Scaffold this active site. Structure first.
Site, PDB file in Angstrom:
ATOM      1  N   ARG A 178      33.870  17.079 -37.724  1.00 14.31           N
ATOM      2  CA  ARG A 178      35.293  16.986 -37.401  1.00 14.31           C
ATOM      3  C   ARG A 178      35.757  18.211 -36.629  1.00 14.31           C
ATOM      4  O   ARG A 178      36.572  18.996 -37.123  1.00 14.31           O
ATOM      5  CB  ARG A 178      36.131  16.831 -38.672  1.00 14.31           C
ATOM      6  CG  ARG A 178      35.956  15.504 -39.383  1.00 14.31           C
ATOM      7  CD  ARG A 178      36.767  15.461 -40.660  1.00 14.31           C
ATOM      8  NE  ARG A 178      36.373  16.540 -41.564  1.00 14.31           N
ATOM      9  CZ  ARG A 178      35.237  16.569 -42.255  1.00 14.31           C
ATOM     10  NH1 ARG A 178      34.370  15.573 -42.165  1.00 14.31           N
ATOM     11  NH2 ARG A 178      34.958  17.616 -43.023  1.00 14.31           N
ATOM     12  N   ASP A 243      29.009  17.883 -46.457  1.00  8.46           N
ATOM     13  CA  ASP A 243      30.074  17.085 -45.855  1.00  8.46           C
ATOM     14  C   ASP A 243      30.004  15.555 -45.952  1.00  8.46           C
ATOM     15  O   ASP A 243      30.451  14.853 -45.050  1.00  8.46           O
ATOM     16  CB  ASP A 243      30.223  17.503 -44.384  1.00  8.46           C
ATOM     17  CG  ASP A 243      31.576  17.135 -43.806  1.00  8.46           C
ATOM     18  OD1 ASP A 243      32.599  17.364 -44.491  1.00  8.46           O
ATOM     19  OD2 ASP A 243      31.615  16.615 -42.668  1.00  8.46           O
ATOM     20  N   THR A 244      29.474  15.022 -47.042  1.00 12.89           N
ATOM     21  CA  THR A 244      29.415  13.573 -47.182  1.00 12.89           C
ATOM     22  C   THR A 244      30.082  13.191 -48.500  1.00 12.89           C
ATOM     23  O   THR A 244      31.255  12.794 -48.511  1.00 12.89           O
ATOM     24  CB  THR A 244      27.964  13.066 -47.108  1.00 12.89           C
ATOM     25  OG1 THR A 244      27.177  13.728 -48.101  1.00 12.89           O
ATOM     26  CG2 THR A 244      27.359  13.339 -45.712  1.00 12.89           C
ATOM     27  N   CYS A 349      20.092   6.380 -45.218  1.00 13.46           N
ATOM     28  CA  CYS A 349      20.307   7.601 -46.000  1.00 13.46           C
ATOM     29  C   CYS A 349      19.289   7.921 -47.100  1.00 13.46           C
ATOM     30  O   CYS A 349      19.111   7.148 -48.039  1.00 13.46           O
ATOM     31  CB  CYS A 349      21.699   7.577 -46.636  1.00 13.46           C
ATOM     32  SG  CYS A 349      22.085   9.210 -47.328  1.00 13.46           S
ATOM     33  N   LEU A 350      18.651   9.085 -46.998  1.00 13.78           N
ATOM     34  CA  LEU A 350      17.702   9.504 -48.024  1.00 13.78           C
ATOM     35  C   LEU A 350      18.445  10.080 -49.227  1.00 13.78           C
ATOM     36  O   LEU A 350      17.991   9.941 -50.356  1.00 13.78           O
ATOM     37  CB  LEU A 350      16.712  10.540 -47.479  1.00 13.78           C
ATOM     38  CG  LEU A 350      15.644  10.003 -46.530  1.00 13.78           C
ATOM     39  CD1 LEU A 350      14.791  11.141 -46.021  1.00 13.78           C
ATOM     40  CD2 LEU A 350      14.783   8.979 -47.247  1.00 13.78           C
ATOM     41  N   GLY A 351      19.595  10.706 -48.984  1.00 16.26           N
ATOM     42  CA  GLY A 351      20.375  11.292 -50.067  1.00 16.26           C
ATOM     43  C   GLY A 351      21.282  10.324 -50.798  1.00 16.26           C
ATOM     44  O   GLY A 351      22.107  10.719 -51.621  1.00 16.26           O
TER      45      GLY A 351
HETATM   46  C1  HEM Z   1      28.464   9.374 -49.699  1.00 16.26           C
HETATM   47  C2  HEM Z   1      27.447  10.094 -49.152  1.00 16.26           C
HETATM   48  C3  HEM Z   1      26.680   9.899 -47.987  1.00 16.26           C
HETATM   49  C4  HEM Z   1      26.842   9.015 -46.926  1.00 16.26           C
HETATM   50  C5  HEM Z   1      27.971   8.003 -46.748  1.00 16.26           C
HETATM   51  C6  HEM Z   1      25.700   9.189 -46.046  1.00 16.26           C
HETATM   52  C7  HEM Z   1      25.453   8.437 -44.920  1.00 16.26           C
HETATM   53  C8  HEM Z   1      24.320   8.489 -44.130  1.00 16.26           C
HETATM   54  C9  HEM Z   1      24.098   7.656 -42.955  1.00 16.26           C
HETATM   55  C10 HEM Z   1      25.069   6.614 -42.392  1.00 16.26           C
HETATM   56  C11 HEM Z   1      22.857   7.966 -42.437  1.00 16.26           C
HETATM   57  C12 HEM Z   1      22.151   7.355 -41.216  1.00 16.26           C
HETATM   58  C13 HEM Z   1      22.603   7.947 -39.902  1.00 16.26           C
HETATM   59  C14 HEM Z   1      21.886   7.328 -38.703  1.00 16.26           C
HETATM   60  O1  HEM Z   1      21.290   6.242 -38.841  1.00 16.26           O
HETATM   61  O2  HEM Z   1      21.909   7.939 -37.615  1.00 16.26           O
HETATM   62  C15 HEM Z   1      22.341   9.011 -43.315  1.00 16.26           C
HETATM   63  C16 HEM Z   1      21.114   9.617 -43.144  1.00 16.26           C
HETATM   64  C17 HEM Z   1      20.616  10.613 -43.975  1.00 16.26           C
HETATM   65  N1  HEM Z   1      21.290  11.162 -45.077  1.00 16.26           N
HETATM   66 FE1  HEM Z   1      22.978  10.590 -45.908  1.00 16.26          FE
HETATM   67  N2  HEM Z   1      24.814  10.148 -46.550  1.00 16.26           N
HETATM   68  C18 HEM Z   1      25.439  10.623 -47.684  1.00 16.26           C
HETATM   69  C19 HEM Z   1      24.943  11.710 -48.435  1.00 16.26           C
HETATM   70  C20 HEM Z   1      23.794  12.443 -48.166  1.00 16.26           C
HETATM   71  C21 HEM Z   1      23.273  13.523 -49.004  1.00 16.26           C
HETATM   72  C22 HEM Z   1      23.731  13.874 -50.412  1.00 16.26           C
HETATM   73  C23 HEM Z   1      22.241  14.077 -48.328  1.00 16.26           C
HETATM   74  C24 HEM Z   1      21.460  15.127 -48.822  1.00 16.26           C
HETATM   75  C25 HEM Z   1      21.548  16.396 -48.344  1.00 16.26           C
HETATM   76  C26 HEM Z   1      22.079  13.295 -47.096  1.00 16.26           C
HETATM   77  C27 HEM Z   1      20.944  13.319 -46.293  1.00 16.26           C
HETATM   78  C28 HEM Z   1      20.527  12.281 -45.423  1.00 16.26           C
HETATM   79  C29 HEM Z   1      19.321  12.332 -44.608  1.00 16.26           C
HETATM   80  C30 HEM Z   1      18.118  13.273 -44.746  1.00 16.26           C
HETATM   81  C31 HEM Z   1      19.397  11.345 -43.692  1.00 16.26           C
HETATM   82  C32 HEM Z   1      18.436  11.127 -42.543  1.00 16.26           C
HETATM   83  C33 HEM Z   1      17.346  10.088 -42.807  1.00 16.26           C
HETATM   84  C34 HEM Z   1      16.507   9.799 -41.573  1.00 16.26           C
HETATM   85  O3  HEM Z   1      16.912  10.199 -40.465  1.00 16.26           O
HETATM   86  O4  HEM Z   1      15.444   9.167 -41.694  1.00 16.26           O
HETATM   87  N3  HEM Z   1      23.002  12.240 -47.063  1.00 16.26           N
HETATM   88  N4  HEM Z   1      23.223   9.307 -44.352  1.00 16.26           N
HETATM   89  C1  LIG Z   2      25.648  10.976 -39.968  1.00 16.83           C
HETATM   90  C2  LIG Z   2      25.368  11.747 -41.283  1.00 16.83           C
HETATM   91  C3  LIG Z   2      26.277  11.335 -42.439  1.00 16.83           C
HETATM   92  C4  LIG Z   2      23.904  11.649 -41.683  1.00 16.83           C
HETATM   93  C5  LIG Z   2      23.839  12.758 -42.800  1.00 16.83           C
HETATM   94  C6  LIG Z   2      24.914  13.827 -42.425  1.00 16.83           C
HETATM   95  C7  LIG Z   2      25.388  13.262 -41.072  1.00 16.83           C
HETATM   96  C8  LIG Z   2      26.662  13.783 -40.418  1.00 16.83           C
HETATM   97  C9  LIG Z   2      24.195  13.294 -40.140  1.00 16.83           C
HETATM   98  O1  LIG Z   2      24.099  14.083 -39.201  1.00 16.83           O
HETATM   99  C10 LIG Z   2      23.178  12.232 -40.452  1.00 16.83           C
END
Ligand code: HEM
Ligand SMILES: CC1(C)[C@@H]2CC[C@@]1(C)C(=O)C2
Ligand SMILES: [K+]
Length: 406
Positions: A178, A243-244, A349-351
């Protein structure tokens, strides 16, 4: 608004100048502001001239399709504006299959289900601690009093980084999702990298058990991960950690503060909390990134050109009435909660497991101690929009006499 000159290949009837960083009907809520893209007057795939000019798929069907077809829709430039998507080099997010594969596996080792199972006690502990601390006050600024500290401290614990670095880090991650105009994506990214580099160096020398050590000393493609690749994967972990869930928690608590029967429903039937978590994840979805066209391609009757950027709002799928009836209504009993809140395709999403745990723990532990609360009288809640949307402030109030310690 500064509209960029309509490219020759874009039909004028497909134009709809939606600004993802400042939606027109933001005052009604951010999800509502984005939902205007799903009104009858808007085609399924439009072109906005804002933020440099780009496409926006408005339907769950198209969003899922594009996310599955990495061949035409590449993650190499997944952020809007162009400058951001190009400087964006996080791993595995800036890579398409099959490259991302090995890297995704490593990141999973650090934030996957087993790790969540391992840290559950600390998660439970922090939730209870923070809430019991606020409980007798009868008020709190939810965004800074809980939404931020709860998930971020758990992340810093997981990554082995001092809580003292939170303010500095949060300011930078927020600049990437943002932008406030103070710095470019590249600059916020570089500064974040400057923080990580010496830490990674140090943890490669003397390895630990924290997430940063595991990643920095991991194996990809049968060989040792490079420092650069480590920096890039850790940069992403930081953004996801800070930031999620942080923002999502505030949308959910804002809703609960206005919905006594929904609160009471989870209080009496805590077994419903996981479903409620899913429904809130759908209704209050908050992420919007996209892809870049690898070549000229006709998608659903629309001619997309190589180099064209396309926003594929993860937020919109579940709000799409074609996917969920009465999409703006929160129903914990919905027989099928369809959404792409955690994404779709190879980059799912892995997290997400860590996120659900934090959400479910928050719902149960908050409603237990503070079953009755509301938004401070007067308070005008404002939302903000970007790659990840959020809540500016969330002043809550309650009668301590109704609360209960455990
Ligand atoms: C409510 C919480 C969260 C939402 C809505 C969210 C959403 C997402 C989304 C939409 C993507 C895919 C983006 C794309 O396809 O370009 C993503 C990827 C990912 N998220 Fe989350 N996320 C959340 C929390 C987290 C947390 C807690 C972590 C941990 C630090 C995190 C780590 C990741 C990682 C590593 C990926 C990349 C996976 C890959 O590229 O193969 N996220 N997330
Ligand atoms: C789009 C995302 C939510 C996903 C995890 C954090 C974020 C901003 C990324 O850059 C990948
Ligand atoms: K890039």
């Amino acid at each position: 608004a500064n509209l960029a000159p309509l490219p020759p290949h874009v039909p004028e009837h497909l134009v709809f100048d939606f600004d993802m960083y400042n939606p027109s009907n933001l005052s009604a809520g951010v999800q509502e502001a984005w939902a205007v893209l799903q009104e009858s007057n808007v085609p399924d795939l439009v072109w906005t001239r804002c933020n440099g000019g780009h496409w926006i798929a408005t339907r769950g069907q198209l969003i899922r399709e594009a996310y599955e077809d990495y061949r035409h829709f590449s993650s190499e430039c997944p952020f809007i504006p162009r400058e951001a998507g190009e400087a964006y080099d996080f791993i595995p997010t800036s890579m398409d299959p099959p490259e991302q594969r090995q890297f995704r596996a490593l990141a999973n080792q650090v934030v996957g289900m087993p790790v969540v199972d391992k840290l559950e006690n600390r998660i439970q502990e922090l939730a209870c601690s923070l809430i019991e601390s606020l409980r007798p006050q009868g008020q709190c600024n939810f965004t800074e009093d809980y939404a931020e500290p709860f998930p971020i401290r758990i992340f810093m614990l997981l990554a082995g980084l001092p809580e003292e670095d939170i303010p500095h880090l949060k300011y930078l991650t927020d600049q990437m999702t943002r932008p406030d105009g103070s710095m470019t994506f590249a600059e916020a990214k570089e500064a974040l990298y400057d923080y990580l580099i010496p830490i990674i160096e140090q943890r490669r020398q003397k390895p630990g058990t924290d997430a940063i050590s595991i990643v920095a000393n991991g194996q990809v493609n049968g060989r040792p991960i490079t420092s650069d690749e480590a920096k890039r994967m850790c940069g992403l972990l930081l953004v996801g950690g800070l930031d999620t869930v942080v923002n999502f928690l505030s949308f959910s608590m804002e809703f609960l503060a206005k919905s006594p029967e929904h609160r009471q429903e989870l209080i009496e039937r805590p077994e419903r909390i996981p479903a409620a978590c899913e429904e809130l994840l759908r209704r209050f979805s908050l992420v919007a990134d996209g892809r870049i066209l690898t070549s000229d391609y006709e998608f659903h009757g629309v001619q997309l050109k190589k180099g064209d950027q396309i926003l594929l709002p993860q937020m919109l799928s579940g709000l799409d009435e074609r996917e969920n009836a009465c999409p703006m209504h929160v129903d914990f009993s919905r027989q099928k909660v369809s959404h792409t809140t955690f994404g779709h395709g190879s980059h799912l999403c892995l997290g997400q497991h860590l996120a659900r745990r934090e959400i479910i723990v928050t719902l149960k532990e908050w409603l237990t101690r503070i079953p009755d609360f509301s938004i401070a009288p007067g308070a005008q809640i404002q939302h903000k929009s970007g790659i990840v949307s959020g809540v500016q402030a969330l002043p809550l109030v309650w009668d301590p006499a109704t609360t209960k310690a455990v």
